[PDB]
Amino acid sequence: QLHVAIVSSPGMGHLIPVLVLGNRLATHHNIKITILAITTTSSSAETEFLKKTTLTNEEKTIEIIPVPSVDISHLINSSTKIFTQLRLLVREALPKIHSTIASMTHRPDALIVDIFCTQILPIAEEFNISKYTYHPTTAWTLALAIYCQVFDKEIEGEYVELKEPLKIPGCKALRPDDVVDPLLDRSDQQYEEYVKLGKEYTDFDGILINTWEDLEPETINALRYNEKLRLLLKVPVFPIGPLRRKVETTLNDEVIQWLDKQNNESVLFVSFGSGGTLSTKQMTELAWGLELSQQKFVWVVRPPSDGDADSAYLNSAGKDTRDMSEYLPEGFLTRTKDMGLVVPMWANQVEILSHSSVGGFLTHCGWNSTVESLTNGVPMIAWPLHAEQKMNAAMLTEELGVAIRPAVLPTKKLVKREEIQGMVRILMQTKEGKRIKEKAKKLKKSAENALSDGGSSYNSICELVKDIRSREL
Amino acid sequence: QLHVAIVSSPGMGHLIPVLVLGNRLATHHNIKITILAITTTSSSAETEFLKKTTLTNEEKTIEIIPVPSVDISHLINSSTKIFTQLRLLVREALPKIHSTIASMTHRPDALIVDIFCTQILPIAEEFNISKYTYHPTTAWTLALAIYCQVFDKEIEGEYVELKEPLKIPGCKALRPDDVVDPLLDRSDQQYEEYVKLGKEYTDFDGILINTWEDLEPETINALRYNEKLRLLLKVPVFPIGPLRRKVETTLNDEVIQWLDKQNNESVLFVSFGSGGTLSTKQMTELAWGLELSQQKFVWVVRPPSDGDADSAYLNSAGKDTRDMSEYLPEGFLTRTKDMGLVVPMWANQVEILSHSSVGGFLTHCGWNSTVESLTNGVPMIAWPLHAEQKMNAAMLTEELGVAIRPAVLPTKKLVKREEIQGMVRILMQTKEGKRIKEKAKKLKKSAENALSDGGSSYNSICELVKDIRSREL
Ligand SMILES: O=c1ccn([C@@H]2O[C@H](COP(=O)(O)OP(=O)(O)O)[C@@H](O)[C@H]2O)c(=O)[nH]1
Numbered sequence: 001q002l003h004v005a006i007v008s009s010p011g012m013g014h015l016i017p018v019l020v021l022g023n024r025l026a027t028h029h030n031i032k033i034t035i036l037a038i039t040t041t042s043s044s045a046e047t048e049f050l051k052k053t054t055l056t057n058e059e060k061t062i063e064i065i066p067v068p069s070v071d072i073s074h075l076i077n078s079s080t081k082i083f084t085q086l087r088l089l090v091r092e093a094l095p096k097i098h099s100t101i102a103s104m105t106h107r108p109d110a111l112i113v114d115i116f117c118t119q120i121l122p123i124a125e126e127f128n129i130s131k132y133t134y135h136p137t138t139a140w141t142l143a144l145a146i147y148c149q150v151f152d153k154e155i156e157g158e159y160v161e162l163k164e165p166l167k168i169p170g171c172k173a174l175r176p177d178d179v180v181d182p183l184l185d186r187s188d189q190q191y192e193e194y195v196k197l198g199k200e201y202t203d204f205d206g207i208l209i210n211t212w213e214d215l216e217p218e219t220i221n222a223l224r225y226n227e228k229l230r231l232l233l234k235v236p237v238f239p240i241g242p243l244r245r246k247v248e249t250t251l252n253d254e255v256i257q258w259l260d261k262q263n264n265e266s267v268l269f270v271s272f273g274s275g276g277t278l279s280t281k282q283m284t285e286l287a288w289g290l291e292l293s294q295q296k297f298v299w300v301v302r303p304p305s306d307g308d309a310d311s312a313y314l315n316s317a318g319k320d321t322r323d324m325s326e327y328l329p330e331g332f333l334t335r336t337k338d339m340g341l342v343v344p345m346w347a348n349q350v351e352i353l354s355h356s357s358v359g360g361f362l363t364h365c366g367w368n369s370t371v372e373s374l375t376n377g378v379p380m381i382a383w384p385l386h387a388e389q390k391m392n393a394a395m396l397t398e399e400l401g402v403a404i405r406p407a408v409l410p411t412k413k414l415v416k417r418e419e420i421q422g423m424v425r426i427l428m429q430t431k432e433g434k435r436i437k438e439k440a441k442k443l444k445k446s447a448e449n450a451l452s453d454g455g456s457s458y459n460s461i462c463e464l465v466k467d468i469r470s471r472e473l
Numbered sequence: 474q475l476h477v478a479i480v481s482s483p484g485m486g487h488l489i490p491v492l493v494l495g496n497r498l499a500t501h502h503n504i505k506i507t508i509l510a511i512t513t514t515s516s517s518a519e520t521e522f523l524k525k526t527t528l529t530n531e532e533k534t535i536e537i538i539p540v541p542s543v544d545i546s547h548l549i550n551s552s553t554k555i556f557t558q559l560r561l562l563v564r565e566a567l568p569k570i571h572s573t574i575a576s577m578t579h580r581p582d583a584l585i586v587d588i589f590c591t592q593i594l595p596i597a598e599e600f601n602i603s604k605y606t607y608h609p610t611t612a613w614t615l616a617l618a619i620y621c622q623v624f625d626k627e628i629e630g631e632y633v634e635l636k637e638p639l640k641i642p643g644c645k646a647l648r649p650d651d652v653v654d655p656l657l658d659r660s661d662q663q664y665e666e667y668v669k670l671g672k673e674y675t676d677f678d679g680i681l682i683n684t685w686e687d688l689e690p691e692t693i694n695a696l697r698y699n700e701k702l703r704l705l706l707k708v709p710v711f712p713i714g715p716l717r718r719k720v721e722t723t724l725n726d727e728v729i730q731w732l733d734k735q736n737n738e739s740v741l742f743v744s745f746g747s748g749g750t751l752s753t754k755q756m757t758e759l760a761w762g763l764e765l766s767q768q769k770f771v772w773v774v775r776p777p778s779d780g781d782a783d784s785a786y787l788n789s790a791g792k793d794t795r796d797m798s799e800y801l802p803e804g805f806l807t808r809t810k811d812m813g814l815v816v817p818m819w820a821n822q823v824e825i826l827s828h829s830s831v832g833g834f835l836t837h838c839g840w841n842s843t844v845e846s847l848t849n850g851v852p853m854i855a856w857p858l859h860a861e862q863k864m865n866a867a868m869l870t871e872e873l874g875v876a877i878r879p880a881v882l883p884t885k886k887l888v889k890r891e892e893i894q895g896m897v898r899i900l901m902q903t904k905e906g907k908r909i910k911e912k913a914k915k916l917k918k919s920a921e922n923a924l925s926d927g928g929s930s931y932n933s934i935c936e937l938v939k940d941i942r943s944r945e946l
C-alpha cells in the first residue's frame with residue numbers, strides 16, 4: 001500500500017478539494033494519505049474542521065498535519081491580491097514543510113500539491129519523491145495557465161483590451177471578458193506569479209484535475225495530443241473529477257427541516273462560496289429580485305463589501321456584529337418570512353444541494369460549488385465574481401447549457417432586480433428552466449459514470465497509481 | 474419538360490459533381506439532361522466512369538457527350554498551374570462546344586457550366602439560352618471568388634503576407650494561410666484568371682452551389698443581401714447540395730469484403746482525392762503514423778511527389794509500374810497485414826464511406842470528399858492540399874466542429890507520425906472522437922432534410938426551374 005502526501009493551499013476552497021481527493025484515494029484506491037494542510041492565520045473554523053476530520057479516522061488511512069502560516073504582513077500591502085498572497089504564504093512555509101517531511105517517521109511515496117503549492121517542487125525533488133499537482137478545477141483553466149507563458153510573449157498590452165478571443169491550441173476560445181483574475185492586470189504581480197504557475201505545472205510528474213472526459217474531451221485531448229500544448233506540458237494529465245464531499249446527514253439542521261416542508265425542486269439556493277461577497281447596491285438589488293420572483297429560496301448571506309469580490313476569503317472571521325437585517329432592505333425578512341430562509345456566514349451547501357426541494361442554484365461558479373450542483377443535478381444562475389469563475393461561467397452557460405446568466409457580467413454591470421426576478425423565474429417557473437435541469441442531470445449521470453468503477457475518472461486514478469508505482473523503482 | 478445541358482470541366486473532381494447534378498435534375502425534377510463533359514487526355518478512369526453512367530440510363534433522360542481535350546502543350550510550360558491549364562483547355566474547346574450545341578437536333582433551354590467553364594458565356598448568350606454556373610463547393614469560396622475583384626484593388630502585395638484576416642462582407646474571415654491556391658502568388662497568371670473567374674460568375678443568370686442553408690446560412694445570406702456583395706453579384710444563388718453519388722452496391726469489391734470483417738466504426742479511410750499526392754517525406758511520416766496508431770485503416774495511395782500537391786490530377790491514369798512497397802517504408806505492408814489495407818490509385822470512396830466499419834476519414838477536404846463523408850456521418854481529419862481545401866478545412870474544423878487538424882497546415886509544416894498517431898487516436902479512440910461523429914451525423918441529417926421534398930435544396934432546385942421557365946419567353 002502506497003503512502004501519498006497531499007499539500008493543501010490556505011483556505012477552505014483549497015483544503016476541501018484536497019481532503020476529498022485524499023478520502024477518494026484512501027477509500028476507493030486503498031492508499032495511506034497524509035494531508036499537509038497550509039493554514040490561514042485567522043480561522044479556528046479551518047482548524048476545528050481539521051480536528052473533526054482527524055477524529056473521524058479510526059482507520060488512520062487518512063491523517064491531517066497542519067502547516068502553520070508564516071507571517072507575511074511585512075511582505076504585502078493594501079493592494080496585494082489574494083493570488084500573490086497565497087503564493088507568498090506557500091513560499092515562506094516551504095522550509096517548515098521540508099522539516100515536516102524530513103521529520104516523518106515513514107516517508108510518502110508521492111506528493112500531490114494544490115494549485116498554489118506548485119512552489120514546493122524542490123522539496124519533492126530533493127527527497128526524490130514522486131511529485132504531482134492537483135488542479136481542482138477545469139482543464140480549460142489549466143490549458144490557459146500553461147499556454148499563458150506563450151500568450152505573455154505573443155500578446156502586447158492587456159488581454160482585457162483585445163478585440164479577438166484568445167485561442168488556446170485545441171481548446172474553446174476565451175473572450176477578454178472571461179479571463180482569470182491574474183490576466184486582468186498584467187502590471188500586477190499576480191499576473192507574473194500566474195505565468196510562472198503555468199510553467200511550474202509542467203515540471204511535475206503529472207497533473208490531476210477535478211474534471212472528466214465527458215465534460216472536457218476536447219481540452220483534455222488538446223493537453224494530451226495538441227503539439228503546441230505538448231511542447232509545454234510533456235507530462236500525463238489525470239481527469240479524476242468530479243470529486244466532492246459525500247453528504248453527511250444531520251437530523252438537527254433547521255435549514256434541512258425548512259426544506260423538508262417544501263415542494264420538490266421548488267427552492268432556489270443562493271450562495272457565492274466562502275470567498276464571495278456582493279456590493280451594498282447589488283445585495284439590495286438581489287434581496288428585491290428574490291422577493292419579486294415569488295419563488296422559495298435559501299440564501300447564505302454575508303456582510304456586503306464594495307471592494308474586492310473575494311475580500312471575505314481570508315476575513316470571514318472578522319466579527320461584524322451587525323444582524324442580517326441591517327445590511328438588507330428593511331423588512332425584507334418580514335416580507336419573505338414564508339418565501340425564503342436567510343442563512344448567515346456558512347451552511348452545508350452539499351447537504352442543501354442534495355435536498356429534493358432544491359431545484360435551482362444561484363452560484364458564483366466556483367468549481368467546487370459547480371461540481372456540487374452538477375453532481376446533484378441542479379441548474380444554475382451563473383454569477384462569476386473572482387478567480388476563474390467567469391471562465392467556468394462561460395463554459396457552463398454557452399457550452400454546457402446548464403446555467404443561465406445576466407446580459408452583462410455581474411462584475412461589470414449592476415444586475416437589477418427585474419433581471420434577477422426574470423432569471424429566477426426562467427430557472428424556477430419556465431420550460432427553459434426544466435430543460436436546463438435535464439441537461440444538469442445528464443451531466444450528473446455522466447459524472448456518476450466517470451467516478452464509478454471503470455469510468456474515465458476511476459481509471460484515471462488507477463493510471464495515476466500506476467504512474468506512482470512505476471516511479472517507486 | 475425542359476432540356477438542360479451541363480458542361481463539365483476536366484477531371485473527376487468536376488465530372489462527378491456534374492453527373493450527379495444532371496442525375497438529380499433528371500430524377501427528382503423530371504428534366505432532360507445532356508452533360509457536355511470536357512475530357513482529359515489520359516484517363517480510362519474518366520471514360521469507364523462515363524460507361525457506368527451511360528449503362529444506367531435505359532430512360533435516356535440523361536445523356537453524356539464527351540468534349541475531346543485540345544492539345545495545349547504549345548500554350549503551357551513547366552510553371553503553368555492547373556488552374557490556368559483548365560481555363561485554357563476550356564477556352565480552346567469552346568468552338569467544339571459551339572458546333573455541338575449548334576448541331577443539336579433539339580436545343581437545350583438552359584446551360585449550366587462547371588466552375589472552370591465560365592468562359593463559355595458567349596455560346597449561351599449567342600444562342601440566347603439561359604446560362605448558369607455550377608460552383609460544386611462552398612458558398613464561402615464563391616463569395617471569396619466574387620469579392621476577389623475588390624481585394625485585388627484594395628490590397629497591395631501578397632495575401633499570404635497579410636497580418637489581418639481577409640474580411641468578405643457578411644462572411645467568416647479568412648486567414649492569409651487558408652486562401653485558395655490562385656491567391657498564394659498574385660504574380661502568377663492563375664491569380665488573374667481567378668479574379669476574372671470571380672467576375673465571370675456574375676455575368677450568368679444564376680449560380681448553383683453544392684452547399685445548403687443549414688451549412689452556410691450567413692454566407693448565403695451575404696451573397697443574397699449584403700449590399701457590398703450584391704453590388705458585384707446581382708443574380709440568384711441556388712444552394713442545391715449536398716449532391717453526391719448514391720452508393721452502387723458492388724459484388725466483388727475486395728476492400729468492401731475486408732471491411733465486412735471489421736468492427737463498426739473501427740476503420741479509418743485515408744485518401745487525398747483524385748488530385749492529391751504527398752511528398753516522399755510526408756508519405757513516410759504517414760505510413761508510420763498509421764502504424765503507430767494501431768487503428769485499422771484503408772488507405773488509397775498514389776506515388777509521392779515533392780512538387781505540386783495536385784500533380785496527380787491530370788496523371789491519374791498513368792500506370793507507374795512501381796509497386797506500392799517501393800515508395801512506402803520497407804515492410805510497412807508486411808507489418809500492417811492485419812491492421813490496414815493499402816489501395817492503389819482509385820477506390821469506390823462512396824461505397825467505402827457508407828460502410829458500417831468506417832468510423833473515420835482522413836481527407837484532403839476536397840468538397841466532394843467532404844460532402845461524401847458528412848452525408849455518411851463520418852468525422853474527418855482535415856488535411857488540405859490544393860485548390861480551396863484549406864478554406865474548407867478551416868470551415869470544417871473551426872466553425873462546424875466535424876473535423877480535426879494539425880497544429881500547422883500540412884502544406885506548411887511536416888506532419889510527423891507522432892501527431893498523426895495522436896490525431897488518429899483522438900478521432901478513433903477518444904470521446905472527442907465520438908462527439909465529432911455525432912456532429913457529423915447531425916450535419917448528415919440536416920443535409921437529408923435539405924435534399925428531401927420541401928427542403929432548402931429541393932426548393933432551391935424548384936426556384937431554379939422557375940428561373941429557367943421564366944427565361945424561356
Ligand atoms: O455557505 C457555504 C459557502 C461555501 N461552501 C463551500 O465552500 C467552497 C466555496 O469557496 P470558494 O468561494 O473558493 O468557491 P469554490 O470554488 O470552492 O466553490 C465550496 O467548497 C462550497 O461547497 C459551503 O459549503 N457553504
Ligand SMILES: O=c1ccn([C@@H]2O[C@H](COP(=O)(O)OP(=O)(O)O)[C@@H](O)[C@H]2O)c(=O)[nH]1
Pocket residue numbers: 485486487489744745746747748749773818819820821822823837838839840841842843845
Ligand atoms: O480514391 C478515390 C479518390 C477520389 N474519389 C472520388 O473522386 C471525386 C473527387 O472529389 P474530391 O473531393 O476528391 O475533389 P478533388 O480534390 O479531386 O478536386 C470524389 O467524388 C471522390 O469520391 C474516389 O472515388 N476514389
